[PDB]
Assembly symmetry: D2
Homo-oligomer: 116 residues x 4
């Protein structure tokens, strides 16, 4: 898969399961066009968002619904979401893993980029 998202919970030491993820691509007219969406699995992973053919050069936004995640565990968290915005495929096709580590008042995000 050229785009994978992996979400972990820093409070429980576990994958963050059933987290909603929305991917957008910046259009010709400079607005955020829907691109792909899905929910993390029991492993905290979301695969199958796109293909190398559909995943062209552009600016992409990955929006992870962290607030719904925490509310369902009884936690009122600080952030509305974790958003990752990046230029993709500008030097040709790459594989991108977007990792997010969640706490109620903090998150970190990291990208692992590989060249197939």
């Amino acid at each position: 898969c050229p785009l994978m998202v992996k979400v972990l919970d820093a409070v429980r030491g576990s994958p963050a399961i059933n987290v909603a993820v929305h991917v957008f691509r910046k259009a010709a007219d400079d607005t955020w066009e829907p691109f792909a969406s899905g929910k993390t699995s029991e492993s905290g992973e979301l695969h199958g968002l796109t293909t190398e053919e559909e995943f062209v050069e552009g600016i992409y936004k990955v929006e992870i619904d962290t607030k719904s995640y925490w509310k369902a565990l009884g936690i009122s968290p600080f952030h509305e979401h974790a958003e990752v915005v990046f230029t993709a495929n500008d030097s040709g096709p790459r594989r991108y893993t977007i990792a997010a580590l969640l706490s109620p008042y903090s998150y970190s995000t990291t990208a692992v980029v590989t060249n197939p």
Copy 2:
């Protein structure tokens, strides 16, 4: 100062100086309206963004221009910017510090909410 931003550089172990920071407030039509902005100081800090009077409950976005920071250092970065989006709530403490720790391919953001 109800809203402060602090930016650190995890590569140099230093404040992140002269980083542009834009704050937006979400309007009734769900667009982002410019609210406040500035550049981080030599201490990596930005204060004086707003007043108790104007910082009412609502949804706010803090955009940190990380890509320009890394480009100035000659380091290829991943993100276009770091965005922090949150609801300001009068039930909680009165002072919000948005801290960001920057690396070229990773950032972390934490909220410290006191008084």
Copy 3:
């Protein structure tokens, strides 16, 4: 594997390859006894450190040689190592993944604990 270590580099957006890892177990006499060691793979992962039979209850120390990693990329980093110290298997056998995200002046560590 009941104990796995995964090391990422936050400067390059890549696995941290060939990182030395040393695991110790706190002995009867309260010193750190060598337990296992290895080097991360091209995926930044170290598997095969131990077995469920050898990996008994105890206090374990995972020591990741981050300073040698950065020096070989031409970086003089802040830390000597990243050390993760934890009680394991106290409520029965678990699977532990110790993840470390490295920057020259910062690191984070996270544990993912699963119950087989």
Copy 4:
């Protein structure tokens, strides 16, 4: 103050108050000799650990007693403590801030080295 420690709690969005902190210096026999210690303040900070005079080049360990902090809050933690191990170098800036961001199953530590 050449050495300061700052601890934040990522679950509550607050300073981590009354956290024990022990600093050690590595001796010639490669054992850790007690150097300085204290409890974090209401601001999550510990200053006055050492003086410019006594903080000479060497290898130092800062141990943060995270497990007692989480136990006091009724939250099951993973780590026994967070350890930060580093060489103090006179070629670099003169002020070391060791920052730690705590979650029950994760911590991050950053060094901010200034002046």
